[PDB]
């Protein structure tokens with residue numbers, strides 16, 4: 106049994122000469138030489154079986170990624186686990202090895218306008234496919250965008266994804282939420298459960314602004330502070346946009362605030378392409394109903410050199426709506442065992 110940095114990393118004989126890459130959202134990720142395809146691959150070790158929530162997320166990641174097939178979405182190449190439910194303690198997910206993620210790249214590298222434009226095109230082309238399957242990613246952020254040595258981009262980590270449920274999107278003010286703070290749409294903190302496609306567009310907007318300056322645009326330090334940052338740049342919402350917020354706690358909180366002026370995008374990003382800034386404005390719209398949708402974003406002049414709807418595929422079928430929140434970890438283990446069976450010899 107192979108070992109890395111104290112931990113069992115039990116992937117062989119197919120996968121050899123392991124090197125530690127890092128820690129991701131679920132534990133240890135290694136690279137390894139795939140003896141069958143004769144390439145290095147990325148392998149993540151998942152140990153979810155004690156907790157229903159880790160089980161739920163591992164199952165979502167696995168079901169979604171195995172169903173999706175798209176050039177801008179990470180696939181699953183292989184899944185390693187024990188031959189029986191009883192013996193199964195860890196799951197290893199094998200994926201294409203990528204050179205970096207956008208988080209590391211933004212810490213270290215200035216992006217040309219040409220790179221920003223190509224990265225944004227690829228994120229939206231991947232998201233068009235995701236949203237066409239009636240799926241919300243709900244955790245788009247630079248660390249969830251992988252890049253290879255030629256800057257092909259792939260969306261990863263569908264652990265927090267859900268089937269879109271707009272008619273059930275309303276909630277009260279300051280309702281707890283799971284997805285990463287800096288990339289959370291303002292309505293999350295106000296009156297939204299994050300069950301509509303507009304939640305992902307806000308996150309892409311945040312990513313775009315971060316590509317323009319290498320710094321997060323709304324680096325809140327905590328839940329309501331995230332909204333301080335957003336309003337500090339967008340300015341006070343209009344009467345129309347407040348009238349759309351029926352919940353009194355949410356609306357009266359906004360009305361309690363001193364007037365804030367819009368900060369013009371060209372002042373925040375004086376070196377940015379004016380077309381990139383027009384699209385940024387449309388993605389970072391306060392009112393989620395007025396926020397641009399993925400297919401309109403692809404059609405925006407900023408992306409004219411790449412836009413080609415005939416080469417921006419959609420999913421053959423929408424995804425199976427929701428069913429895991431009430432399933433215990435024992436049933437969830439069985440479903441994980443079942444979903445991974447195709448990678449077993451035979």
Ligand SMILES: *CCC(=O)Nc1ccccc1Nc1nc(Nc2ccnc(C#CCCNC(=O)O[C@H]3CC/C=C\CCC3)c2)ncc1Cl
Nearest residue numbers: 126127128129134147200201202203204205206249261262
């Ligand atoms: C989808 C989210 C996710 O899984 N992210 C994540 C997070 C942490 C770790 C791994 C992953 N997944 C993942 N990563 C990659 N590829 C990747 C990610 C991060 N960093 C790297 C890297 C690197 C450095 C390359 N090595 C290098 O330059 O080696 C030199 C060093 C000099 C010394 C000796 C000789 C060797 C040459 C890669 N890909 C896929 C996935 Cl899923």
